Design a protein around this ligand. Structure first.
Ligand SMILES: C[C@H](Oc1ccc(CCN)cc1)c1cccc2c(-c3ccc(CS(C)(=O)=O)c(Cl)c3)c(C(=O)O)[nH]c12
Ligand SMILES: [Zn+2]
Ligand SMILES: [Zn+2]
Length: 232
């Protein structure tokens, strides 16, 4: 009823949307992994009379449900999707998207890592993102590579019309007590990568983490703090 939806509020297989700003929604789904249930976020950005999707809903059936929820709530076609790193919460569902008319994109680094690890592989490569600090425009967003953090390939997304920063899994929510799944992370570089985000997007008004509740710019400093203490 208007609050940001939480993990025990979303059965696995259902998707909810949350209006962030004019023409900007997050999507929230839940998935089981290694016997625990987790929420995850993605983004939807209006692109004229089309939609740009950022990240899958963490699985084929969740992603089909996402497309149905978009049709119900928004009613514009998703024409393109960008996956912000190679993990299943970002690319699991790319095959569903590709069969539903959506052109799927990721950096070459993400595509190589997805292929090597046996995850679904976006079709199109996003060049111009291979060096930390790189930025490219993609429809109504800017894509930014901050450097290694949660993963070596992680991208963040800015919506300039709304000053919305989608941090993906490089950014944690304010209640986080650890740095999440750090198996592919660079804990030593992660604070430097967060500092790059802070420097590049100082006017962000909403910051959306990969998992959990949006907030403001404090999510960036909190993330740096938890990662440094995790490493400690
Ligand atoms: C989708 C992801 O798959 C994998 C990630 C890495 C590997 C290693 C080999 N390639 C394999 C699978 C995955 C699976 C299951 C969980 C996660 C979490 C997560 C997020 C928040 C919290 C709460 S918190 C900040 O307080 O710790 C926690 Cl515990 C975990 C994250 C993330 O951090 O982005 N990714 C998750
Ligand atoms: Zn991840
Ligand atoms: Zn994640």
């Amino acid at each position: 009823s208007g609050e940001y939806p939480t993990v025990n509020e979303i059965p696995v297989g259902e998707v909810r949307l949350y209006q962030i700003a004019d023409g900007v929604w997050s999507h929230i789904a839940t998935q089981s992994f290694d016997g625990a249930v987790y929420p995850s976020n993605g983004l939807i950005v209006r692109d004229g009379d089309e939609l740009l999707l950022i990240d899958t809903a963490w699985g084929a059936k969740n992603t089909a449900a996402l497309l149905a929820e978009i049709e119900k709530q928004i009613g514009l076609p998703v024409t393109r999707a960008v996956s912000t790193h190679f993990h299943d919460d970002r690319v699991g569902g790319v095959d569903v998207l590709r069969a539903a008319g959506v052109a799927t994109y990721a950096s070459p680094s993400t595509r190589r890592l997805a292929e090597a690890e046996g995850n679904e592989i976006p079709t199109h490569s996003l060049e111009g993102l291979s060096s930390s600090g790189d930025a490219v425009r993609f429809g109504p967003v800017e894509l930014f590579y901050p450097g290694a953090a949660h993963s070596t390939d992680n991208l963040v997304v800015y919506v300039p019309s709304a000053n919305v920063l989608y941090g993906g899994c490089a950014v944690h929510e304010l209640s986080s007590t650890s740095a999440g799944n750090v198996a592919d992370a660079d804990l030593a570089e992660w604070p430097t990568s967060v500092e790059r985000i802070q420097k590049h997007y100082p006017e962000a008004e909403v910051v959306i983490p990969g998992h959990g509740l949006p907030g403001g710019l404090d999510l960036l400093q909190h993330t740096a703090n938890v990662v440094k203490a995790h490493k400690n």
